[PDB]
């Protein structure tokens, strides 16, 4: 199924995924397209940050669902 990912520059990229793909698998697919290593990535869907170990099906992510890619600004 084809989903959309909003990149760091606000561009929409398409990703071909399966409901059984884990969040880790989706991060690997984003690395393949954007070059961003998975440990930098945070993925947001409908306001929720997606958790490692879960699948797209766990979040009811389907064709045309949009995931938003964000990184981190660390502060203490």
């Amino acid at each position: 199924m084809q989903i959309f990912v909003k990149t760091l520059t606000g561009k929409t990229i398409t990703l071909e995924v399966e409901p059984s793909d884990t969040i880790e698998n989706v991060k690997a697919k984003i690395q393949d397209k954007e070059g961003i290593p998975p440990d930098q990535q945070r993925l947001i869907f409908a306001g929720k940050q997606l958790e490692d170990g879960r699948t797209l099906s766990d979040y009811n992510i389907q064709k045309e669902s949009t995931l938003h890619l964000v990184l981190r600004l660390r502060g203490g």
Binding site: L8, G10, T12, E34, G47, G76
Partner: protein, 317 residues
Amino acid sequence: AKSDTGKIGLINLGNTSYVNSILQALFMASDFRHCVLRLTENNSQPLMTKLQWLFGFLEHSQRPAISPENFLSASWTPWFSPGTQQDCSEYLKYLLDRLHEEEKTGTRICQKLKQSSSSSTSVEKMFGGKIVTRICCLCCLNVSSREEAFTDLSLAFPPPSRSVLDLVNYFLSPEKLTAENRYYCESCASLQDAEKVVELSQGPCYLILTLLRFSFDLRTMRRRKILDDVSIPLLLRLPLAGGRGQAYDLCSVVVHSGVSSESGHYYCYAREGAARENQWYLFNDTRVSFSSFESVSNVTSFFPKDTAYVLFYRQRP
């Protein structure tokens, strides 16, 4: 207490300014503070109950500053290592998600038990909005719509926009889905060029904006902070579905101070977040002082390493 502002500071427990700045911004979002403080004694919201205890001390303590340790531990982001610096927007999103889910779950259980024997949460009411994406296949002209909830807008910087409105307009700008990003149309049963339109179908009571102040450098293979100054308006006109607009008043600004994305410090500017009380304050861990919108506007000009990251706006009635 000790600050002549009448406000109470928060002790930093070891790289915890990312929590303190968020708690102060939420405390100053008046309608949310009221939701929290009015939570009935008999409730099934354990985390909101801990937040109400903390907000009680921020309202009534005679001490200059207090420790939010109990709430910080109860709301601890499980993938965060204590003592490591963290992203304040990541903590905020986790906190809102936890407060939403515990209330939603409680309501659902209560209703299902009653139905077996034969609504919206505070987070949804205060911070929830809706966005609709419409994809038009340029071959068959079918338009596929998808509505999704949000608690914030993640505002990307355009590829190498000077104002918040510029970033909001860019977030809502139409986009062509072409070449490597062609849309798979099931009516055409093939990849097709398409037009993507995004609209806000529901403006939230409090609009949370996160400025995506990071890029990924492909030469060094490292992320980098974006230090570009972005002007913040006191009054923002949020574009809504059908060419409509809704006025929003600035409530608070959470600033990340640091040259890089790997470390730094957070502080918050806020005024009362009730429907439009006009006094601005600067909250920096234990120290709270009177401040101004002039200081909010001066941030990056005076201190180039300091940049607004999370903004809170309240819908104008």
